[PDB]
């Protein structure tokens, strides 16, 4: 897999955002994770976490997996990095997202994220509290 450039257009929520990629506005859905909706418990916290992680970053990058690059709703499916740190993993590590939606062929970073989830759970953080 490889990282490609992007810029932030707008925050949406814990696991979706509007980015500019190859010069076009797209909504991205983070691969392999599920944040609560804003109206659910820890939804606001997830949305804030994701929002801040991209606002604070100097360099946003997207990394597509081996499979489908857009979902049925037109959302780009990616791993997203903020100054080299994966947002998808950071959310899981903090108990603000569960590992989820692990479809065959776009699952390269599954076991990295599952390791993060296990540490979140042990620490009883957020969703695991
Ligand atoms: C993360 C992800 C979601 N989706 C689809 C499955 C779910 O369909 P349904 O809407 O039919 O439930 C939906 C979940 O996304 P959200 O968690 O953003 O709602 O997005 C994919 O198709 N591929 C993916 O990699
Ligand atoms: Ca969600």
The protein residue whose alpha carbon is closest to atom 20 in ligand 1 is: 71
Pairing of strands 24-30, 76-82: parallel
Ligand 1 centre to CA of 100 (Å) is: 9
Q: How far are the Cα atoms of 3, 36, 113 from residue 57, in angstroms, in the given order? A: 15, 23, 21
Question: How many residues are listed for the chain in this entry?
Answer: 129
The resolution, in Å, is: 1.8
Cβ neighbours of 105 (radius 10 Å): 9
Rounded Cα gap, residues 97 and 117, in angstroms: 8
Contact 100, 34 (CB under 8 A): yes
Using DSSP, how many helices (H) and how many strands (E) does the chain show? 3, 8
95 in the Ramachandran plot: left (φ > 0), alpha (ψ -120 to 50) or beta? left
Looking at residue 70, the DSSP 8-state letter turns out to be B
* Domains observed in the chain: 1-129 (2.40.50.90)
């Amino acid at each position: 897999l490889h990282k490609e450039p992007a810029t932030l257009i707008k925050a949406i929520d814990g696991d979706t955002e509007k980015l500019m990629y190859k010069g076009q506005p797209m909504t991205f859905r983070l691969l392999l994770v599920d944040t609560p909706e804003f109206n659910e418990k820890y939804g606001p916290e997830a949305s804030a976490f994701t929002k801040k992680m991209h606002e604070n970053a100097k360099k946003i990058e997207v990394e597509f997996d081996k499979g489908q690059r857009t979902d049925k709703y037109g959302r780009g499916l990616a791993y997203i990095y903020a100054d080299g740190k994966m947002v998808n993993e950071a959310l899981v590590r903090q108990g603000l997202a569960k590992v989820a939606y692990v479809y065959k062929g776009n699952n390269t970073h599954e076991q990295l994220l599952r390791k993060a989830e296990a540490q979140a759970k042990k620490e009883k953080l957020n969703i695991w509290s």
